[PDB]
Amino acid sequence: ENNELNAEIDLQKTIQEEYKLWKQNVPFLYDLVITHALEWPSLTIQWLPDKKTIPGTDYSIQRLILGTHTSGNDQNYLQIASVQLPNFDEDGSYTIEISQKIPHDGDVNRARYMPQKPEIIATMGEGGNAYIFDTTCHDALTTGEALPQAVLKGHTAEGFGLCWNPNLPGNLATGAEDQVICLWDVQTQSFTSSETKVISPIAKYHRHTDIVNDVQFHPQHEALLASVSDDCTLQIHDTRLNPEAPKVIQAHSKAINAVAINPFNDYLLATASADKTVALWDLRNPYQRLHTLEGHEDEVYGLEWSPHDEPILASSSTDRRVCIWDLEKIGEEQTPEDAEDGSPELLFMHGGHTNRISEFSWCPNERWVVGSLADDNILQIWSPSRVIWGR
Template sequence: MYLTAETKVLEDTVEERVISEEYKIWKKNTPFLYDLVMTHALEWPSLTVQWLPDVTRPEGKDYALHWLVLGTHTSDEQNHLVVARVQIPNDDQFDTSQYDSDKGEFGGFGSVTGKIETEIKINHEGEVNRARYMPQNPCIIATKTPSADVLVFDYTKHPSKPDPSGECNPDLRLRGHQKEGYGLSWNSNLSGHLLSASDDHTVCLWDVSAGPKEGKTVDAKAIFTGHSAVVEDVAWHLLHESLFGSVADDQKLMIWDTRSNTTSKPSHSVDAHTAEVNCLSFNPYSEFILATGSADKTVALWDLRNLKLKLHSFESHKDEIFQVHWSPHNETILASSGTDRRLNVWDLSKIGEEQSAEDAEDGPPELLHVMVCITSSSECKLERQKYLCEEVEGVKAN
């Protein structure tokens, strides 16, 4: 046992060194890859991140104000839903030749102080597994908790600093699940319609705009029971208000139509991967195209018109994939991230292009860019840690 423990410590030490070295190499090359790099250490790890759509451009300033939704994953301390303000310089302010080694920053954007700061902290029941704002009213944020309930907060109705008592006081409490989960998706076409995926093998649908029958509790409008294992993710179709997809540990992708008379059988079901399917994303430009990510280390491309045939398999990740996300600016650009500490950016238009042997060593032709995501494997040890990719509006790779 002593030798085994000693070997484990040695392996962990070597892994930490490799991770640190990879990150240093990536950071050293950031001036050649990006217009701007900003780093910010959170007080606690966050299992979720999402840009809010609001952007403010203060008069006479050389930056714009953006906002992020975050959560906390503390040890035994109070958890919070967090809204953070981010100062991002205007495009004409970038100077990639400037590097501040003390701040670990490229781009020459003045002092680091105050560029990313917490604006609102709201007490939360346990860690925030996921948080998503409602498209029709971004002040309303739904969260997944370690319990079965989904919570809804209107952050304009809460003080900027949390109640010292630690009491969590959501504006709505959504009931229907029996266990926790991670998947959460608002309908961009029907205001107030929210989907949630759970470890209890189900997907729940609520209409929060209808309001609670009594108190602050809202029961599920429908519960979809087609999966036979943990449902990892769920997503509304972006162009059809009644269609959504779900993926699960049963290795299946299911497409559902809320107009159907049954909630136990999907419209379409396909064996999508050879391991658990962790995530999915519908293309915002095409009504037929979607992508799924899996524990089998691949991203799969699908066409709703013929789900029997996988369009393409993106292969470069070295470990499980936990997030896929389409670019809001380009219909052929897709990002994926996972426990290999990589955020890969793919370009569908380059699939099948000829490569030199040297280029092929770096990955397939459709692999546009690779970003090193984290500096320590300690985050990997968080239970069911999700690695997320979010696009920074107006800040693009060269």
């Protein structure tokens, strides 16, 4: 084929040209940029919540959950990386160490620590199985990392939806390509045994008619679960009732890849879609689309509210960009020239990656620090300049 190959050549040329310009502009756009090459690409990233300060040094040690997807032959791993970060305070020699390498069955599609017990990590893995690990544990006989404490059997195809209930310890939700949502009750209670425990769902939802891409519990209401899907619906589930029926919203006309509930509000929810937009919703009046955030140039896949600032939201796309939105600029006037760059609330575009964004994660221990991964093995840890977000 003659158009495909030369179009891919031209795309790579564009990427290399724009990466060179991005590097030239970094000193004006960032307060920090740390880049680390990984041995394997990761589909997932999450900051763990611990921070270790060292008296007499100007940096702290923090940690990231990572995974692998050799997806053929090589053994996969749930990994924990330890990274130095500078200690900010108000007005490039930093290392990484892969400190834990835990054998994992198949690609690590998604991994999340339990908020109430961060040493417990759930993953979505081979064939649809979910797995539970205790990262403080060891092999029965050796110092090698432990086998899964539990395997969660229920999904019949692989999935990427995974989230813990921040208000009900050990409560887990998963969504997968079998179009099903499984609810689980994980009792770390039970990991006093010489063998991996097998766990079955406490509940299953067959309410979507296509791949379930993302699930999230409302940060402050333990019975409330949001789900989004390739069937182009956002669904709000009450986990007390019986599969009664959820609230269904035709939120976009193309696939919905991610969902994110504001951690500071009761009501504000955002969705990210293959239609290249992020949409905002008020849970008290969920059938009215409040606003549509424009700026990405391809499908939007990642979405996470800032854990420190109520109006700050971030998204990521196969356009290779991570965008940061500031909802306080809703309504501000802009010229049609500026509008070509995006909606008024678009605050910052991170252009440091040179392939599709896999996932990113806000650093809970520092303000305005993001860790992001792309498919070409690159991890970047970065902070936009206080010139841009300050005041």
